């Protein structure tokens, strides 16, 4: 409905990540984070996440912009945070990462593709393995789990309840009503 | 869509939210935003969620469900036309005593739908996840209807069409709004 | 669509709602919102529902039907061009004495259409549901026309085209609006 | 489409309605709304319906036709470019003495087109309906042109192209507007 | 298709003709050629027409029908699997006393299907032709079954599925071939 | 297609030619070759041209027509199933007294179909050519049926469906072959 | 497909018939022809029907079923790879004591699949027909397995995968052929 | 492609069967027929199954596997190019001591692949079935290789590419055939 | 294709045509022809004529191993083009009996492929195609006399050779002059 509803929530420092993460969505979220820091460098931002994931580089545009700005960015999972979505949920300010009780969190390894000559396939494989090491290291730091446990637990699609995500260290609290 | 504000925005000003389509992430994110906005405008006055939906994404439905239970205002639910699948789940999720259907509205309940492709172990993970999702939906529907988990399981095995009056007998709504 | 307000929004200001397309959930949700808005503006003055529609979704049609019967104002119905299937059902649903057609407007009645694919038991569920839907439509049409259920069943077995005058003799409308 | 209001909205302010496309339900609903609005603004002053149309839906055309005959103002018709099929029917439907074409405008008359698929009895129902529709169009064209039903039937058997002057001799218009 | 001659050619040597597909002109021309060839080989010995067909072209079916009635040998008909529409017509066309179905074979009768597009008068010609075709099929079915034309008309209004035993009671076949 | 020689080659050995498909250049060239071959085998014995065809190319049809009239043997024609358009023209082209239809065979006559695209003068050339083609077909049909050119023109204006008996009354065939 | 005769034709010479694909009318007509041919060669010696099939048309399957029961020789059935749906029905239809599966072969039973679109009464006819077809399949499966109709109904409600040993315990086969 | 009998048929005369494609029902039915034919020609002499296959249908693979174990002759297996998935399963299924690979041939083992769409309970049935299929494949591979079920499970979790020499160390073959 | 068809008449003289892209179907046909010719006569030369843009590496290795396996020498003759696995099979003919006609083209390059899915699936596919390349390069080294390092460098991109250059490289033994 139409300020449109999202613009009115942005006035209260609420950003919606409510779709697949591509470059357009990431550029919108980065712009909103930068704008909110300029409006007030001290007050919390609320990043609400309902996303099946998407582009790793687009996800890292959002991740780095969160860590760059001065305000704490709270994260709240509603519905689902899968893949890069769950990475960004875990990237919220320490003590301010939440999920609502019936929200789902899914973690897994990065997906990609490579076509062409053996040496091109080698370059693409080395790059996606380095990307996975980078994602896993940051998830280790943000969850408190070892790199070896994160590697094993992301080998395949791993679905967590809100409560299990909290036990894992992906969030700090389940927001009960 | 006519203007007075477009018609939906004018109804939102009176705390009326329309769920009038298939439930996907875009629709859920719109409904969640409207619920949060209405709570900020007035944390005490009732909200009116009108439902004409064939259902859709279970996770999108749960974004709406958890946002309803999270906010302070009671959310009334009114079924007009049809509430099927996740649509009927959200109809049942309205504030106790304030779940309604108009007399010719249809309610349909059934088990979740999905897909799985790839290696045996990937199919196993997808099967375990959709069975756990069904247990979660059935448990909440049990709490909101007063029916046993075993009855909900049996009654959702296939497409199960209810009249407004049958939805009330089932405990999915509290009253049929007669004219 | 020209401006004066777009033309439809200007008509809505005079309590005129246009049903001028196929009936789907989006069209029904727009019409329901307009009916609720007009009731809130004035609970006593007539509303004018103008119908040029080939029909569409039965559940979407029932969202409109139940909203008409729910609100306090009389809803006049006027058929201009064509009212077929759920369109003719909604024409017959207007306030008693205030259902009209212009002289060359066409009214068509027929049984509901649908589909079913899959297992024998899924086809059985879909068949039972569409037969119950037809019984529901025929019962209400009987009440609104004064015709017996048996006559409506026979007369809707196939596409049945009526002139405005025949629709009036049938009891689908009260008057032909002559110039 | 330029601005001064878009150009069509500025013409509507001077009681000029453009029928400049294929006739479907959307176009008919727009024209009907404009006729009703112009009658509400002034029930006495002429309306100008300018026609450049290859025709289209018969029922949509009849929505326009009946709305013209219903309202109190005279509706002048002016053919610019082409009036074919239902377009030429609506050209002939203007107020007596106020139906015009510009000198190089084309008018085409022909019988209605359709289709029918399915069982023998469904094909029979569709054939009876389109023949009754043709009888209805031909009867009204007879009344508005002064030609006999037999002549209209023969002259519409195939595509029949008329000059502005021939349309006037036929009684489809009253005058060729000379510069 | 195996070899021994392909299997169908070996059966043709024993005066067995297979109608095992949809009836089109190619299938009909093959069957007509086989009937003529078998009559030339021996004008006295029975021919065996085995039918597993969902039907198809009425004119192609009548090529087969008239060729059966034309030649001197009796043509036995045996339904194996299904004889629907023109397939069931040809099953009923076998020599009196020599029309069979195996116990689980299905017979379906219904009215002819077709289509028509274009001008009202083209649709009228197509409708008249398919109604005359239906009268022709029903008259011959009346003669071959012993049922009245009125009963055949009513019983073919919609898809009518018969067991082998019901086909025999109806007079479409003379006997169920039991093992 | 079964073997005994394939079935068509065995019938050709008895001077039977099948025209059992749409007439295109390939079908015409096959039929012309068969007529020439049969004349070379025996210049005195009758040939039997069996026709089940919806028609097709006029020039391909005239390849067959002129080859029939050119060779010394009489060519009998037998309509089985349907002879439409150029098919019915070739049925009428059989030796006088030896043109037959089976009782339930259908005959259809109508004017030629075609197309034209491009400049006005190209469309004029294509229109003149198809009108001259129609004059040529109607003149020959007049000679073969005994009907006047004026009657053939009127009767072929639209699709005209004939029974075997009506085809005989028209002079398209000499006899209905009764069983 | 190699030569020695193609390999299938060489096996047919030893009274071995391959059902190694989806069951459609073409496959059924081939199998029916092979059964009839083998009975004519020797009315006493066993026939070997080897089955690796995901199923297919129920009427095509019944053409095969009835032809098996009709002929005098015992037809052994051997499941190699998979017998699903109509495939498992035909496996169960082999001569008593001569129905086999190899140890790793899979048998799957489930209810028939179909579809229906159109008017409520057409959907009702299609639903009644597929339910009657399922009763017919279940009755015969009851007779051939020794299981009750009610047990077969419950066990075929969804896809039910059996090992060779489970198929034997069920009564679908008599023995697992061990090496 | 080449003739001498096609080249494959000439090799079959020397008891050589070539599996050079994806394993589907058609390929499996051809291989099963060739194995049965060769056993009938000589129940004692070795058969040579040469394998270059990326795998395919598990049930089709098991048709071949069970037919190999059923017949009396030893079936040697020789991998040339690649044996992946069901291809490598069949390579391992050759007579003990007579399973070979040429030095540059690749062997790949991995878990079965599939898919499932629909209701939670349908996905559960499909998941249980593919997990049971994997247990069956792994048990037989354990028996034929000498590896534990737990090692086979771990080693097939993902695509596992082996050289000829590694396949021999694993127990999938007995020897690398050096030139 | 004229009439035995012409290819079957050449097969009667122990001539096999590899005249298309190499896939499993073509490899299975060539393997069958090699086995058939060995059964007809285990001593006389076979003539494998190659006009092929290459194709599947595993299909190519089915042909390669079948050539080395059978007892007869298999001569190779390049007519038109031998690219990729085509040029690998040209180099695989019996020592001293690998030929090209003077205007025939030979092209060598590294293997092509693809990989989709999880990081670990991409890793498995990359390791496999790199091992396949090491295997091709090692065999080409043995058959040409060039070092593995030179073959690696020379196959990094599409490398087009004349018949004479293919002979200097050791991919063939002689240019068949008229
Ligand atoms: C910090 C510095 C800078 O490096 N950038 C680059 C930049 C560009 C786009 C996205 C970024 C995301 C993360 C980090 C840097 C990004 C822009 C920024 N500016 C502001 O932040 N200006 C307040 C502002 C932001 C948004 C807005 F809408 C209004 C004002 C203008 C003045 C300036 O020096 N800077
Ligand atoms: C409750 C708390 C919080 O955790 N969030 C996070 C959040 C973010 C996105 C979606 C959510 C959905 C459900 C529950 C929390 C969600 C936002 C909220 N805020 C407000 O509600 N602010 C008034 C407001 C809302 C909307 C509007 F338009 C204007 C004002 C900002 C102040 C604050 O502490 N909170
Ligand atoms: C005559 C009567 C009525 O039956 N209708 C229904 C109607 C709807 C659509 C098209 C129609 C065409 C022909 C005839 C009736 C049509 C609307 C009309 N109204 C007006 O004309 N109101 C001034 C008005 C109209 C439009 C506008 F933009 C402003 C004012 C509202 C008051 C009222 O009683 N009526
Ligand atoms: C009757 C009751 C209620 O159950 N609903 C639910 C409802 C929601 C959506 C569609 C419906 C359709 C038919 C029937 C109920 C529908 C809304 C209504 N409200 C109003 O009608 N409010 C005036 C209003 C409407 C529109 C507008 F722009 C301004 C005010 C808010 C206060 C309230 O208690 N109610
Ligand atoms: C009865 C008469 C005739 O009108 N025809 C025309 C005809 C043609 C095609 C299909 C037809 C189908 C139904 C009825 C007539 C058909 C052919 C027939 N002939 C034979 O039957 N000849 C023995 C014969 C038949 C088939 C065969 F393979 C060998 C010989 C040639 C001699 C002859 O006078 N006649
Ligand atoms: C009549 C004359 C002639 O002008 N032609 C040309 C011709 C060619 C192609 C199609 C034609 C169609 C219609 C009319 C002429 C056609 C061929 C014919 N010939 C024969 O008929 N030869 C016996 C023959 C024919 C066919 C066959 F299979 C065996 C012998 C060669 C001897 C000869 O003088 N003639
Ligand atoms: C063992 C028994 C049997 O159960 N079958 C069924 C069967 C059918 C299809 C595939 C099968 C695969 C594996 C096992 C059984 C298979 C066929 C077999 N027969 C032969 O093997 N006959 C020699 C033969 C075969 C083919 C051929 F061309 C010539 C001779 C016919 C005589 C007989 O009793 N049997
Ligand atoms: C029993 C009777 C009959 O009703 N038919 C019809 C029929 C046709 C096709 C499949 C059928 C399957 C089951 C039952 C009837 C079937 C054909 C059969 N005939 C034979 O079986 N003939 C020996 C034969 C068969 C095949 C073959 F290649 C050679 C000879 C011709 C002689 C005869 O009276 N009959």
Cα distance between residue I130 and residue I135, in whole Å = 9
Q: Which two tokens stand for residue B34?
A: 């409207």
With the C-alpha atoms ordered A159, A164, A169, A175, is the resulting torsion angle positive or negative? Answer: positive
Cα distance between residue B154 and residue G65, in whole Å = 36
Place of tokens 């759920």: C86
Among I33, I65, I125, the residue with its CB nearest the CB of H80 is I65
Going by C-alpha positions, the residue among I139, I143, I141 that lies closest to residue I97 is: I143
Q: Which residues in chain G are closer than 8 Å to E8, comparing Cβ atoms?
A: 33
Whole-number Å distance, alpha carbon E74 to ligand 8 midpoint, is 15
Helix (H) or strand (E) holding H78: strand H75-84
Cα distance between residue C18 and residue C32, in whole Å = 12
Question: Dihedrals φ, ψ of G48, to 5°?
Answer: -115, 110
Going by C-alpha positions, the residue among D53, G137, H141 that lies closest to residue G145 is: G137
Ligand 1 pocket: which residues have CB below 6 Å?
A 30, 34-35, 38, 65, 68
E interface test, pick of D117, D123, D131 with most E CB neighbours within 10 Å: D123
Whole-number Å distance, alpha carbon I126 to ligand 1 midpoint, is 41
- In terms of DSSP bridges, do strands G75-84 and G47-53 run parallel, antiparallel, or are they unpaired? parallel
Interhelix angle C120-145/C58-70, nearest 10 degrees: 40
Measured in whole angstroms, how far is the alpha carbon of residue D106 from the centre of its chain?
13
Place of tokens 């034919």: H37
Measured in whole angstroms, how far is the alpha carbon of residue H90 from the centre of its chain?
2
With the C-alpha atoms ordered C17, C21, C22, C24, is the resulting torsion angle positive or negative? Answer: negative
Which segments of chain G are extended strands (E)? 16-19, 47-53, 75-84, 99-101, 106-109, 113-119, 160-163, 175-176
Going by C-alpha positions, the residue among F168, F164, F136 that lies closest to residue F152 is: F136
Measured in whole angstroms, how far is the alpha carbon of residue I108 from the centre of its chain?
11
Work out the widest C-alpha separation in chain D, in whole angstroms.
Answer: 57
Work out the widest C-alpha separation in chain C, in whole angstroms.
Answer: 57
Is F21 designated active site?
no
Q: Which two tokens stand for residue I120?
A: 């670990």
Whole-number Å distance, alpha carbon B108 to ligand 4 midpoint, is 24
Nearest residue (by CA) to ligand 7, atom 34, is G48
| 3-state SS class at B76 | strand
Q: How many CA atoms lie within 13 A of B84 on its CB side?
A: 15
Interhelix angle E25-41/E58-70, nearest 10 degrees: 10
Question: What number of other Cβ atoms are within 10 A of residue H82's Cβ?
Answer: 27
Interhelix angle A23-39/A56-68, nearest 10 degrees: 10
All domains of chain I, ordered by start, with CATH? 6-175 (3.90.226.10)
Distance from CA of C151 to the nearest CA of B (A): 22
Cα distance between residue G161 and residue A91, in whole Å = 46
Name the interface residues of I facing H (CB cutoff 8 Å).
Answer: 4-5, 7-8, 11-12, 24-25, 27-29, 31-33, 35-36, 39, 56, 58-62, 64-66, 68-69, 120-121, 124-125, 128, 131, 135, 139
Residues 6+ apart with CB under 8 A from H84: H53, H54, H55, H106, H107, H108, H110
Q: Distances in Å between the alpha carbon of G179 and those of C96, G103, H68?
A: 82, 9, 10
Cα distance between residue H77 and residue H90, in whole Å = 8
Output the CA angle F14-F16-F18, nearest 5 degrees: 150
Going by C-alpha positions, the residue among H116, H115, H64, H104 that lies closest to residue H86 is: H64
Contact A105, A99 (CB under 8 A): yes
With the C-alpha atoms ordered A71, A75, A81, A86, is the resulting torsion angle positive or negative? Answer: positive
Going by C-alpha positions, the residue among D115, D45, D116, D30 that lies closest to residue D75 is: D45
Q: Distances in Å between the alpha carbon of I24 and those of D4, H20, I29, I58, I63?
A: 71, 6, 9, 8, 10
Distance from CA of B69 to the nearest CA of A (A): 6
Measure the CA dihedral C69/C71/C75/C81, to 10°: -70
Cα distance between residue I136 and residue I57, in whole Å = 9
Place of tokens 């068969």: F34
Contact H7, I33 (CB under 8 A): yes
Cα distance between residue B7 and residue H44, in whole Å = 86
Whole-number Å distance, alpha carbon I166 to ligand 2 midpoint, is 73
Task: Give the active site residue among H30, H57, H110, H142.
Answer: H110
Contact A36, A15 (CB under 8 A): yes
Cα distance between residue E53 and residue E50, in whole Å = 10
Cα distance between residue H103 and residue E168, in whole Å = 70
Distance from CA of H78 to the nearest CA of G (A): 20
Q: How many CA atoms lie within 13 A of E173 on its CB side?
A: 31
The structure was resolved to a resolution in Å of 2.2
Contact A107, A151 (CB under 8 A): no
With the C-alpha atoms ordered G155, G160, G165, G167, is the resulting torsion angle positive or negative? Answer: positive
Cα distance between residue E88 and residue A55, in whole Å = 61
Cα distance between residue D164 and residue D77, in whole Å = 13
Residues 6+ apart with CB under 8 A from E148: E142
Q: Distances in Å between the alpha carbon of H95 and those of A80, H30, H73, H89, H91?
A: 53, 20, 9, 13, 10
Among D111, D116, D120, the residue with its CB nearest the CB of E131 is D120
The b-or-e profile of A3-24 (16+ CB within 10 A means b, else e) is eebbebbbeebbbbbbbbbeee
Mutate to test the pocket of ligand 6, among F36, F67, F69 (most ligand atoms within 8 A of CB): F36
Task: Give the active site residue among I29, I56, I109, I141.
Answer: I109
Cα distance between residue F48 and residue H123, in whole Å = 63
Is B110 designated active site?
yes
| 3-state SS class at H178 | coil
Question: Dihedrals φ, ψ of C22, to 5°?
Answer: -55, 140
Name the interface residues of B facing C (CB cutoff 8 Å).
Answer: 1-4, 7-8, 10-11, 14, 16, 18, 20-21, 50, 52-54, 80-82, 102-106, 158-159, 161, 177, 179
E81: left (phi over 0), alpha (psi -120 to 50) or beta: left
Cα distance between residue B17 and residue B30, in whole Å = 10
Q: Nearest ligand, CA of residue G79?
A: 7
Whole-number Å distance, alpha carbon E37 to ligand 5 midpoint, is 8
Cα distance between residue F134 and residue F111, in whole Å = 7
Cα distance between residue I82 and residue I88, in whole Å = 8
Q: Which two tokens stand for residue C117?
A: 């694919």
Neighbours of chain C (3+ CB pairs under 8 A): B, D, G
Place of tokens 């700005």: A69
Output the CA angle I76-I78-I80, nearest 5 degrees: 160
Cα distance between residue I52 and residue I139, in whole Å = 20
Place of tokens 């496996």: G91
Cα distance between residue E123 and residue D128, in whole Å = 9
Work out the widest C-alpha separation in chain B, in whole angstroms.
Answer: 57
Among E113, E115, E118, the residue with its CB nearest the CB of D113 is E118
Q: Which two tokens stand for residue C98?
A: 């205030």
Task: Give the active site residue among B57, B85, B129, B148.
Answer: B85
Whole-number Å distance, alpha carbon B139 to ligand 1 midpoint, is 48
Which segments of A7-154 are extended strands (E)? 14-17, 45-51, 73-82, 97-99, 104-107, 111-117
Q: Nearest ligand, CA of residue A28?
A: 1
Distance from CA of H104 to the nearest CA of I (A): 6
Helices (H), E52-105: 58-70, 86-92
Q: Which two tokens stand for residue F6?
A: 């394939």
Q: Which residues in chain I are closer than 8 Å to H20, comparing Cβ atoms?
A: 24-25, 27-28, 31, 62
Question: Residue B69, exposed/middle/buried by CB under 10 A (0-12, 13-18, 19+)?
Answer: middle
Among C110, C118, C130, the residue with its CB nearest the CB of G123 is C130
Question: Dihedrals φ, ψ of H114, to 5°?
Answer: -170, -160
Q: Distances in Å between the alpha carbon of A120 and those of A114, I66, I129?
A: 7, 31, 11
I14: left (phi over 0), alpha (psi -120 to 50) or beta: left
Q: Which two tokens stand for residue I125?
A: 């596919």
Q: Distances in Å between the alpha carbon of A121 and those of A124, A146, I161?
A: 5, 30, 26
Contact D17, D35 (CB under 8 A): yes
How does DSSP classify residue A111?
E
How does DSSP classify residue F3?
B
Cα distance between residue B20 and residue I60, in whole Å = 60
With the C-alpha atoms ordered F2, F4, F5, F9, is the resulting torsion angle positive or negative? Answer: negative
- Show the 3-state SS of D4-62: CCEHHHHHHHCCEEEECCCECHHHHHHHHHHHHHHHHHCCCCCEEEEEEECCECHHHHH
Cα distance between residue H26 and residue A39, in whole Å = 70
The b-or-e profile of B33-66 (16+ CB within 10 A means b, else e) is bbbbbbbeeeeeeebbbbbbbbbbbbbbbbbbbb
Q: Nearest ligand, CA of residue A33?
A: 1
| 3-state SS class at F18 | strand
Cα distance between residue B43 and residue B71, in whole Å = 8
Whole-number Å distance, alpha carbon A34 to ligand 1 midpoint, is 6
Name the interface residues of D facing C (CB cutoff 8 Å).
Answer: 5-6, 8-9, 12-13, 25-26, 28-30, 32-34, 36-37, 40, 57, 59-60, 62-63, 65-67, 69-70, 121-122, 125-126, 129, 132, 136, 140
Contact H49, H19 (CB under 8 A): yes
| 3-state SS class at A23 | helix
Contact A124, A85 (CB under 8 A): no
Contact G85, G137 (CB under 8 A): no
Cα distance between residue H157 and residue E75, in whole Å = 64
Contact C34, B7 (CB under 8 A): yes
Q: What's the first-to-final CA gap in chain E, in angstroms?
A: 27
Q: Which two tokens stand for residue B14?
A: 């009176």
Contact E171, E146 (CB under 8 A): yes
| 3-state SS class at B95 | coil
Residues 6+ apart with CB under 8 A from H154: none
Cα distance between residue F75 and residue F51, in whole Å = 12
Measure the CA dihedral F47/F48/F52/F57, to 10°: 10
How does DSSP classify residue D69?
H
Cα distance between residue I37 and residue I24, in whole Å = 20
Cα distance between residue F33 and residue F65, in whole Å = 13
Residues 6+ apart with CB under 8 A from A38: none
Nearest residue (by CA) to ligand 6, atom 26, is F37
The b-or-e profile of C73-112 (16+ CB within 10 A means b, else e) is bbbbbbbbbbbbbbbbbbbbbbbeebbbbbbbbbbbbbbb
Q: Which two tokens stand for residue I4?
A: 């035995």
Question: Residue B18, exposed/middle/buried by CB under 10 A (0-12, 13-18, 19+)?
Answer: buried
Helices (H), chain C: 7-13, 25-41, 58-70, 86-91, 120-145, 149-155, 164-170
Measured in whole angstroms, how far is the alpha carbon of residue B177 from the centre of its chain?
18
Cα distance between residue E81 and residue G59, in whole Å = 5
* F104/E34 touch (CB, cutoff 8 Å), yes or no: no
Going by C-alpha positions, the residue among B83, B58, B96, B97 that lies closest to residue B166 is: B83
DSSP codes joined into one string, F133-157: HHHHHHHHHHHHH---HHHHHHHTS
Cα distance between residue E101 and residue G133, in whole Å = 17
Ligand 7 contacts CB of residue G176 (under 6 A) = no
Whole-number Å distance, alpha carbon E86 to ligand 8 midpoint, is 23
Experimental method: X-ray
Among F3, F16, F158, the residue with its CB nearest the CB of E6 is F3
Cα distance between residue B36 and residue H117, in whole Å = 36
Contact E119, D112 (CB under 8 A): yes
Q: Which residues in chain E are closer than 8 Å to G32, comparing Cβ atoms?
A: 50, 52, 80
Helix (H) or strand (E) holding H106: strand H106-109
Cα distance between residue F125 and residue D134, in whole Å = 34
Q: Which residues in chain G are closer than 8 Å to C111, comparing Cβ atoms?
A: 119-121
With the C-alpha atoms ordered I23, I24, I29, I32, is the resulting torsion angle positive or negative? Answer: positive
Distance from CA of E17 to the nearest CA of F (A): 10
Chains D and E touch, contact meaning at least 3 pairs of CB atoms under 8 angstroms apart? yes
Ligand 2 contacts CB of residue A72 (under 6 A) = no
Cα distance between residue C57 and residue C112, in whole Å = 9
Ligand 8 pocket: which residues have CB below 6 Å?
E 10-11, 14, 16, 48, 50, 78, 80, 177; G 32, 36-37, 40, 67, 70
């Amino acid at each position: 409905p139409t300020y449109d509803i999202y613009s009115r929530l942005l006035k209260d420092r609420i950003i919606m990540l409510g779709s697949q993460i591509d470059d357009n969505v990431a550029n919108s979220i980065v712009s909103q984070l930068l704008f909110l820091q300029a409006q007030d460098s001290e007050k919390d931002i609320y990043l609400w996440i309902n996303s099946p994931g998407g582009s790793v580089t687009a996800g890292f545009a959002i991740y780095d912009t969160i860590q760059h700005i001065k305000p704490d960015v709270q994260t709240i999972c509603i519905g689902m945070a899968a893949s890069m979505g769950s990475f960004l949920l875990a990237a919220g300010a320490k003590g301010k990462r939440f999920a609502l009780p019936n929200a789902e969190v899914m973690i897994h390894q990065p997906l990609g593709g490579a076509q062409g000559q053996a040496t091109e396939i080698e370059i693409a494989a080395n790059h996606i393995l380095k990307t996975r090491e980078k994602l896993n290291r940051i998830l280790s730091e943000r969850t408190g789990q070892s790199i070896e446990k994160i590697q094993k637990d992301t080998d395949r699609d791993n679905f967590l309840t809100a409560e299990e995500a909290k036990e894992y260290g992906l969030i700090d609290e389940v927001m009960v009503p």
